[PDB]
Structure formats: structure tokens, C-alpha cells
């Protein structure tokens, strides 16, 4: 399920993201030895945290947003969040004729584009596999012919089976709405709803 | 080339698909501008001197019109558009604001050679006129969200203001007892709306224009200036004590603003000739404030 | 942005003139504008210097087009020192207001052209303006 | 005794051990003052009426000079002292501020009978001139730290301003295309320094004078006023849209301020004759702003 | 690896420290005796701490910056930084022909330039040995011809082996991030990432 | 070692003390009985606490101050702090011909000036012995001929051996810099250093 | 040429004149202060001074040009003391009321040229302006 | 700064031998701030003169008796004796400065340094110029 944004629903301009906050949550156990050497240990997973802020909402905008959020809380679905700043179209073509060799469980994807894709991905962009919902950021990219060497920040959450297909454009965060236990919005005497905030967390 | 003279202009207000060309216009003032985000990124590496300024929004325009009273009473539509309810030729101030958002309309400022400036998403935010010993004129104040330059436009050939109404001396009454020694009766009506800025990250690299607004309050007010006159020693009718509720009417031959119950506060100035000044607002439970528009022969 | 085709050329007396045009194709879709240069294939430039815009005006001189480094887009427009002398001969005796060395010599414009690259003669004017002779002292 | 007339004065700026007597001075304004610490110690014992005021610092002076353009171009040293880099007779606005502290110099205001006021630790903080239909003149603004009265002084017999330059109409260009209907081109340059107050407990019972300062930023700005003129219907060259980057030059017969790339914001006023107003600042990556000083014959 | 900055990437002037806080962190066993005497014992190693604050970052500059930071977090190496206020090139020349006699421990150090270096390193400047990555701070200087006597605030971590070469320019701190666990970036409606800051900490 | 002040170093006017804070630290065990009588017990010593605040510092002023502070932290010396408000010269002459009878361990010094000193010390001034670094404040002074009766706030930290010589002028606080464990200063984009504070404690 | 880069030379009376240039191309896109001194091998600059800015003017003096350092980029434009004396003799006498030391002598230009085998004429004007004489008394 | 840099004014005091002390020093600022070294003034002769007006026919009222006190260290001295000062005071304009009545205009002056040497670099520069003023006195 998609969170309402002024792409799908421009008739409600108040539903735009006044300010997004992409939080990097990678819990680690960091210990500082007296000999000046700082040591880290990583066990848990990394999850992208998204915080959405909203302006004053008119009754119709709030009605639409609240209906969507209550539909989410009813069906127990997953809110999809689209960040416009990450929607630069660089890689274009078909992602079905590209092959990803299997057995890749590290933090690096080696894929043979088979010359079917034009353009090259840029470092810091958003990358995602077609068979897993986790979202990756490209930290480095080296192309030697048709084989690409894409480096990702989160260690690969799945081991490639050889059937996965890279996804570069149209990437959505399969988030789950936090702070929904006590979710409310105050209605002022002037008819507009205020104090609406969405603390979302990537529940892959 | 083509210069643009204010005297050679025509202001047409577009509402409901009909053009209200407001002739008998004494003077109007308007301006257009843009909003910038100018930051200077001085760093320890490079203490730069060149700012990073991008134009991202249109500053809302503030258009003010001064319109003479006319025999066809097109100018009462400004009260109609500002939120007053209509019955016949009289405009009521409703007890509660009807809708959250004001009545939006577009406005053109026509000029020769197909030149025009197109103000959009406008609303009437202020209307005040002074009944005095000079010809009455109501200064309306509208706020726009988006301004633009267009080639073809809407021109109100038929809907236009007639001849200006002849001057007639103002008079203020309590029920039917005249209030002596009037100087200047000034009436003020407002629709204090507020723009709802919804500039978001989807508008980056684009120019944003305000589109929606909500009404904070409506009100009717009047400031009356008299000369301090007393007819008796220890008079009860004319004094400086406040009046919690009293029926007042500021009447003319062509207009009459009625306060069914008024809250009057008085202020005395020890000037060359002593002057008292009233501050008339309707009470809490007062009936709707009346504004009658008489063209001719009442 | 908009249009800036109008630029005035100040050529020097007794000195040969040569201008180096780095043709370019900037696009502002992405915030760092693309620096892609146009590729100069099937391109020819033509330019004449003619006193005044009225019809029948005498041709003071003619630009000599040079196309070099087609891959990166650059190109050169030039004219020999003899052409410079011919231009300076017919220049008006009245001097420019801001510089008492320049004299109006005529008008000019260069026109790009594609000759049947797709069976189309897509020729459009590149730039325009006035040509000013700057009086020398060396000779 | 000896009175002090402004018309009978001579202003000499002392830099690098040489006196720059700035003749062709239309008018100057200056003031001196002291800072006090006045506290009233009213107590339950004695509700006193007499304050405890001690003079402990000299308030920095703000001297403003209005200097006519001259044929020897001594006035360009104000740009030179304010931080601009020099090549020939043209002054560049550097990409980054060169030094943390401004260029400090002393200034004398001479008068008859060995009377003088000595401003020390001065820096040029503002320079702006309006190219208009009147004779151009640049008002410089310098701030002093310490002022004093001295008997002998420095008088610039040789270094002096020549004859004032004849008037010449301004003209603003884009590349080489003139911009029509100019009204008044006003240029502004600043070195927005700030005094670093270091008054400490070792200065108790002494008068403190500011000595050191640091440059917050330098900038070059210009406000251009035009008449709203359009040559075509739906014109592209002349309109109200912002221009992110465009080469601009405000040219005269004796001076030419060049913006290699400019950020222009437009503002329309619906006055008697419509006027548009530009707001020209250099862009982020623009080349250094040029200021050429042509004495005669360019 | 190298932290991006306007020196390495001049095309991104938004990078570059708006304000840098170089803190001194020497843990000590301080004890306040009842007689008024304060006794402190130095046991734990000292480490410089660097707090970097960034100005308004545009989306592309932040993309480059967080791409580099995520590559840091991925490959797990150290993150070098170059403080620009200490980049005053006060010592010209090539330091390969400069010998530091072996067997030296403590704050004092003796090095022989053999008539190669030009320029005097004044007090307050940085100093770093070629082999060890520790960064010292010159507190006093005294030279007798070619031989230079330099006093450093932190005692020499390793005793000179006779091959360590002085590094008076281009000194990089081998640091580790301390904000990695929860590192969020907010995007405004103006189009800039605001309040980006780093709490670095020298490792070893 | 002397802390840089605009007496020795007037070329750096930013090194002046914008505000000093002479803190009286005399820990006591105070108990309030229910019968309204408040009772105190004193065991530990009294130490003068000095807090120094600084204005914005230019690069050269900060360079000098930081070099001095790092020299202090390197040699482990004792910072000497001079307070201008306590430098009123009342007692003048030779302090070598004055004799202090031994065995004085209370809170009062009886000394025979032997007529070699002119002037008289004023109550509230600073007094110090020549053989101990602790600084005393004169709370009372009665002169009966040549013998002086100086009363001091801190109880005499030493028992007079008969060789001590009173010191009235040129008195310095043998302080030790506290808060040096985490000592730093942020450099702003305008080139000036800000946020410098010295919390000093009298380590006799 | 460089119309915006006009500079007026000032020559002292009774003193041999000397002015040195530095041809040193730059490319700061990679990093600030990336400047490479231009090779001046087989370059020969030359110039002249004439009384008026028009044809038929009487020549006043010709600069004794030189190339001080080849491949280092340091060229020199200069003239001996006798030529300065001739300039002072030929200079006008309309002394300014507030700059009584400077008199106008004429206008000047200098042209750099390439005389390389395997190349053609590459004349280019690099200086432009006026020559002002500063009066002297110590002889 | 075409000529503004090398021009200063001298005020010789009447009835006193006037002596000005000069210190040449090669200051390097473009490469790096705060770097200056003296000029080796060996073979760098000095000469100056004073004249009443700038016309072709002008009177040589005086002439500085320049001397190089230190060959190295770039220290030189231009001075004139009491007789020259008296001649200047006698041959000076009677119009007094209003802002300083003791000063009257005497004439113009220049200083040329001639670095004649064995090496073919016999260059000459005008290092000083301006106006000469006489300050009247009464102690005689």
C-alpha cells in the first residue's frame, strides 16, 4: 500500500512531505579500550528510518490521509514511501535480461548487464533487488565492460539465487508505521488539523 | 516600444465565469515579487563571498483598490465575496463564518496592446470606507497567491459600475434620536484569512504559489468621531461612560450600516475643540450587522 | 538564460582576427547542468559582414569558417588580415561612446547548417551583433 | 577664540605611511562618543537617587564620506582598502575573503590653527554609488575604534583628487544587447566586519578602545530600476521570470561594473508608469565581479 | 580512506567544515588529596577528538558525502581527515633525507635535516611520524643549525627505530565515526540537507 | 609557569580575563539539630578555585595560549594565575630582615617587622608565606609598634619554622588546570576560536 | 584585443623605462592556483607610440622590445632614456591643475607574433592605452 | 597606484640640518605574508635635487647630499646641510598653509637610484617624488 503523496494525489497538496528524515539505524556494540583503539561489533540488522512531517491539513486532506492510515491499520499491510530526491532516472532498459550470479552473500553485487541497460548508476543512489524488500544504497560502482560491480551499504540480507533482478528506478520503502499505538491529531477551532507526524520504520 | 500607464488600464474581476469590470476606480496599487532562499556557505576551507540563492516561491501579492460608490451597486459584491449573506440589497454579517476557506476569484489588470497581469486565487480581506464631509469611497484590499502574464483576458463590457452617487451628509442615530456634532464616521469590515503554506520537498527546483487559505475571523467595526457636546449639567444621554448594549445606525442617503446592539467605548481628546471618539463593535448576542445599499430613492 | 545571440565583435586594426567557439549543450534537468558538447557532423557556418541592414547593402567582408575537433564541439571563425584592412577601410569615422578607439564597421551573423544529415537543411542563425574596428597604433 | 567650520576642513587618510588627501569631497559626517556603565544602587537601607556612572570605553565612530569621482582615480583605493584585488585599473571581488582582519588605516580631519581629530584603526565597511541622471557620487562608510585630538598631523599635499569627471549617462547591457528604459542603477559593495570586544578586568579604571576586527563577509550587489516595457505579446527577453544566470554589465563612460553571471529577481510596481526593479547579485560559481575605473578616453 | 573535502573534490564547495572542534581527550587518574595537593596519574592513551559541522548541503553534495561515509561503514577501514587550519605549509622540502636517531621515547625528539628543510615549525603546529598514525602537537621548538629539537604534547607512542620520517605537511587523523549508530539527515522544502555534523574520534 | 595575561603579553589583548571567579571551597559537614542549633565540622582543606572566561580569540592569540597550555600539560608544571584586583602595593620594603617566630600553627601570624617595612596591609588583601605556595587573605590586622598581628582565613597549612618570610606583593596562585581531560575549542568559519574556559584549582 | 583591459603606462622623465610581462596560462578547474608559465620561444613582440589616434599621425617612439627569459614566460617591453627624452619633448603641455606632473604623450599598442616554421601569422594585440610622462627635476 | 605609491612629502625645518633616514628592504607578499629581506645596496648610488617649478626652465634651489651609511642591510640616508635649508627657506613662497601656518611651499623634488656596476644592469629608478615644504622657526 502506497502512502499518499502529491505524485498520485496532487489534489491534496497538504499531503506533501514538508521534511523527510532518512535515519541510518545500524545498532553496534562499540567498546573503547584504554590503549586508544576503538572496537565495534555488529550483530543486529540495519533498517532505514523515515520520519515524515506535515503542515496544517484541511478536512478533506486529513480525511483522505486518515482513511488510508486506518486502512493500513485494518489490513495490517505495509506502507510504501517514495522519496522524490532519490528518483533520478539513470539506468534505463529491461531488467529481465540481466543476470546476477548466485551465491553472493557479502556486501557487493556483481551482475552482467548483457548490454541491455543504458547509462550507469551513480554512487549514493538507491538500489534494490526484485525478490527482497530491503533497500540498498550504492556506495561505489565500477564497470568493466558489461559486468557491473555495485557496492551496497547494508550487507546483503539474502543470498542471491540467480533469479533476482536489480531494480534501480521506482524504489519504495516497505515501511511499517511506528508510534501508531498513540496516534492522534488535534482539530483547531479554525477547521484545520495540526500535529500530524509519521514515524516510519523499514519492516522488511 | 509599449509603455504601461496606470491611467490607461482596466481592472476586471473574474468570478463564477463572469467579468466584473470595476469602473469608477479612483486609484489602485499592486506589486509582484518572488521569494528567495539565499544562504552563504562560508567554510574554514573557503571563506566564500558568493551566495547560493535560488528563487523557489512567489510572494503573495497585496492589491488595494479605491472604488467610488455607483448607482448599479456592483461594489456590494465585495461584501458578497468577502462572506456576507445577501437578502435583497442588504448584506448581513453572519453569526458564524460560513466556510473554512474564503471565496476565491481571479482578477485581471488590462492594458493596451494585449498586455495583462493575471492575479489568481484572490480573496477580499479588507473593506473600509469613511462617511465624512468628502465623497465616500471604499478601499478594498485583496491578497493574491499567483500572479502571471497573459496575452488574452476577460473584459467586462456589460457588467460595469454606473455613475458615481452624489454626496450626502452622514448621520448617526440611536434608535431614532440623532447624535449631535458628527465629524467623521469610519466603518471597517475584514475577513482576516491566512495563507496555508504547503511548500514540500516535492516542490524542490520549482516555483511555489500559495493556493489555499482559511478564515481566522470576520468582524464589523466602526470608529465614530464627535465633538464633546453636553446639553445639561450631569447629562445622562451624552457622557463618557461605556455603553454595553445600545442600538446604533450610521445612516446616509445611499447606505446605512446597522448595529442592532453595539458596545461603545468613548475617548475624550482635549484638543482645540474637545472631541470624543467612539469605538463601536457589535455585542456577543447582537443580531447580524446590516449593510444596506440604496441606489436611488432608497 | 533566454536568448543571448546578440554579441558585438571588436576586431583589431593591422592584426588578424580569430574567434574560437566552444559549442556546448547544457541541460538543467539535473541540478549540476550536463556539460555534454554537441557533435559537429554535417555542420557548416556562414557569415558575412554587411554595412547596415537595408537591402542591397554592400558586402564589407565575409567570415572564413573553420571546423576543427568535431568530437568535442569546438569550432573557429576567422578572417585574414587583408579582410581586416578591407573592413577598417569602410568603417565610419564616428567613434564609440564608451571606447574612443572603436568605430562601427557593419553588422554580421553566422548561420549553422545541417546539409542532408536526415534529408533536411536545418540551418538557423547562431549569433549576431555589430562589428567594431579598433584603431591600432603599431602600423 | 577658534571656531571649527566644516567647509574649512581637510580630510587626509593615512595608509602605509602616505597621506591620501581626498579632495572633491561633497560632504562628510562623523561623531565621537563614550560608553558609560551607569548603575543605581537602591537598597532597603538607602533608596538612593544618585547613580554610579564611570566612563570606561570609547564608542566606535561611524564616519561617512561622500566623494566625487576624479580623473586621478584615488577613490578606487577605497575598493582596494576594502579588500578587492587589483589588476591594472580594474578591481576584482575575490572568490574568498583574503584575510580574517580587514585593512586598517588612520584618518585625520584637519582644520585651521593646528586643530585636528585623529580617527585610528579604521576600515572601509560600505561603498555604494547610484548611476542615475545626476552626477555620480560614492558614499563610503568607515568605522573607527579610537578617536583622539592631536596638534600636528599628516597633510596630503601631493596625493590628491583631480578634477571631477563629467557626467555621462549610464547604460546596462546583457552581453551586448542594451536593456531599454533605464531609470536608476544603484551599486552597493560592503565589507561587513565586526568589532571583537576584548574588554577585560585588566582594563578596569581605564578607557577601552576597540582595536581588532574580523570580516564576516564581503559582497557585491546592485539594484536596477526600469520601466515595464514589452516589445512583443508574450515576450521572452523582457518579462518577470527570474534569471538564474545571465551576464550583466552596468556600464558608463568612466566606470563599468561587470557581473560575469548574475542572479536577477524582478519586482513590478503598478505606479503612474509601470516600473520593474531588479535585484542583481553574482551567482555561486560566477567569476569575480569587475569594477573598472576609466579616467579619460577609457 | 579520505574524507571528502573541497581540497579533494573542489566541484563540491558545500563540503568543508563550517566549524571544527579539536578537543583534547587525555584520561587521567586524578585524586584530590585532603591536604590540598592534586595528584593525577596518566595511564589511558590520549586521543584527539574532531567534531565537524557542515553548512547547508545540496542533494548532490550530500549524496557524495553519505556515499563515502557508507563506503566507510561497509569496508570498515579508518577514515582520514585533513584539518585545514593546520595546513599552513611552513616547512618546504622533501623529508626523506631527514633521519631521526633511534632509541627516543618521551615528549622530546631529535631529528637531523642534513641541510634539507627550509622553514621553521612554530609552536602549535601539528606533527606526525611516518610509520605510526598518531598525531602530535608541537609545543616548543629549538634548533642548533641543522639539528631540530621538537617537544610534542603527547609522549611518543612508539620509540623511534631510526627509520621514521617527519611529516610536517598533509597530516591526516586516523579517526572513527561516533555518530554511525543513529545518523539521520533532514531534507527541507528549500532543497538542502541542514544540520549535518560528525563526531569523529581518533583511533589508536 | 605563568598563565599568559596582558601584563606579560599585551600584544595578545584577547588573552585578558573577561571575568574571573574566585571560588571559596571549604568543604564542611553541616548538621542541623531539631533544637535549632546548626553544627559544623571541618576536616578537609580549603582551596581557592579560579574560573577564567575568554572572548573570541584570533589565530595568533589562540596559538600562543594553546602552546602554553600544552607546555603545561607536557611538563606537568603548575599554572600561576595573577589577579590584577589584588595587586595594590601597600607594604613596601625588604621582607628578608623581618622575622616570624616559629611554632605558629593556628590561624594567625605574629611577625616583628623590625621597622624595615613601610605602610600597613589592609583587611581583605592577599598574603602568602615564602616557603609555602598556599595563598591567604588577611581578615584582620592590628599593629602594636613593630610587631604585626595578621589574621588569615585558611588555617595555617604549615607550622612556621622561623625562616619563613611574608610576601605581600607579587602573589601568584599555584593552580592546576581542571577540566583538562576534555579540553577543546571550536573554530568558527570566520577564523576566530570560541568556547575557551579555564577552570583552575589551587593545587598547593 | 582587450578593450576592457586598457592600462595607461607612466614613464618617468630622465629615467630609462622598463616594464615586464608574464605570459602564464592557467587552469584552476582541477585545483586553484594551477598556473603554467607559457613558453615564449620564437615569439617576438613589437610596438609603437603615435601622437594621435588616427591615420597620418606622427610616430613618437618605438619600444625596444626583448625576450628576457625564453620558455620561462617573462617578456619585457621597454625603451632607453633618449627615447623617453624624445617623448618628453613631444608631449603636450596641457598640465592638469591637480596632477601637474603628468602630461599626455600619445597612444601605444604592442603586438605579439609567432614566426614558427610549420606555422603561419599569429599576430595578437596584448596592450592598449596611453603613454603619460611624469615630469622630473633632478635630471 | 600608478604613481601613488612612490610619492611622499618632506618638510625641512628652518634653522635645522635636515636628515632623512631610508631603509631599503625587499618585502615578499605575493608568495607568502610576512617575509622581508634587506636589499644589498652596494653599487646602488643615490642622487636627488629640488626645483621651484616643473617647467623646463627651473631653478636648482638645493640638492640632497645622499650617502649610503650601510652598504648591506639596505640602509641609506638623504640629507642637506644648514646652508641648503636656509637657501630653501629664503627661496620659498610667502603664501602660508592655512591648516599649519609654519609651512610654506618651497618646490618639487625627485630621487633617482643608479645601480651602476660591472654587470650590464646599469638601471635607474625614481624611488621618491613629491613637494618640499619649509617650516618656519624663531629660535634662529
Coordinates of N, CA and C in Angstrom, one line a residue, chain B residues 76-87 90-94 98 103 127 188-191 218-221 257 288-291:
Chain B
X76 N -21.1 46.2 -4.0 CA -21.6 45.4 -2.9 C -21.2 43.9 -3.0
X77 N -20.8 43.5 -4.2 CA -20.3 42.2 -4.4 C -19.0 41.9 -3.6
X78 N -18.3 43.0 -3.3 CA -17.1 42.8 -2.5 C -17.5 42.4 -1.1
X79 N -18.6 42.9 -0.5 CA -19.1 42.3 0.7 C -19.6 40.9 0.4
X80 N -20.3 40.7 -0.7 CA -20.8 39.4 -1.0 C -19.7 38.4 -1.1
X81 N -18.6 38.7 -1.8 CA -17.4 37.8 -1.9 C -16.7 37.6 -0.6
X82 N -16.7 38.6 0.2 CA -16.0 38.6 1.5 C -16.6 37.7 2.5
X83 N -17.9 37.3 2.3 CA -18.6 36.4 3.2 C -19.9 36.7 3.7
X84 N -20.4 38.0 3.5 CA -21.7 38.4 4.0 C -22.8 37.7 3.3
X85 N -23.9 37.3 4.0 CA -25.1 36.8 3.4 C -25.9 37.9 2.8
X86 N -26.6 37.6 1.7 CA -27.4 38.6 1.0 C -28.9 38.3 1.1
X87 N -29.7 39.3 1.4 CA -31.1 39.3 1.2 C -31.5 40.6 0.6
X90 N -29.4 44.2 0.9 CA -28.8 44.3 2.3 C -27.9 43.2 2.6
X91 N -26.8 43.4 3.1 CA -25.8 42.4 3.4 C -25.7 42.2 4.9
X92 N -25.8 40.9 5.4 CA -25.8 40.6 6.8 C -24.4 40.1 7.1
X93 N -23.9 40.4 8.3 CA -22.8 39.7 8.9 C -23.2 38.5 9.6
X94 N -22.9 37.3 9.1 CA -23.4 36.1 9.7 C -22.8 35.9 11.1
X98 N -19.3 31.2 7.5 CA -19.9 30.0 6.8 C -19.0 28.9 6.5
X103 N -13.9 32.9 -0.3 CA -14.4 32.8 -1.7 C -13.3 33.3 -2.6
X127 N -12.3 45.8 3.7 CA -13.2 46.8 3.1 C -13.5 47.8 4.2
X188 N -15.3 49.8 9.1 CA -14.3 48.8 8.7 C -14.9 47.4 8.8
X189 N -14.6 46.6 7.8 CA -15.0 45.3 7.7 C -13.9 44.4 7.2
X190 N -13.7 43.3 7.8 CA -12.5 42.5 7.5 C -12.8 41.0 7.4
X191 N -12.0 40.3 6.6 CA -12.0 38.8 6.6 C -10.6 38.4 6.8
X218 N -14.1 36.9 10.9 CA -14.7 38.0 10.3 C -15.2 39.0 11.4
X219 N -15.3 40.3 11.0 CA -15.7 41.3 12.0 C -16.2 42.5 11.3
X220 N -17.1 43.3 12.0 CA -17.5 44.6 11.6 C -17.2 45.6 12.7
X221 N -16.6 46.7 12.3 CA -16.2 47.7 13.2 C -16.5 49.1 12.7
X257 N -25.3 51.4 7.7 CA -24.8 50.3 8.5 C -25.5 50.2 9.8
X288 N -27.4 40.1 13.4 CA -26.4 40.3 12.3 C -26.4 41.8 11.9
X289 N -25.1 42.3 11.7 CA -24.9 43.7 11.3 C -25.4 43.9 9.9
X290 N -26.2 44.9 9.7 CA -26.8 45.2 8.4 C -26.0 46.2 7.6
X291 N -25.9 46.0 6.3 CA -25.3 47.0 5.4 C -26.2 47.1 4.2

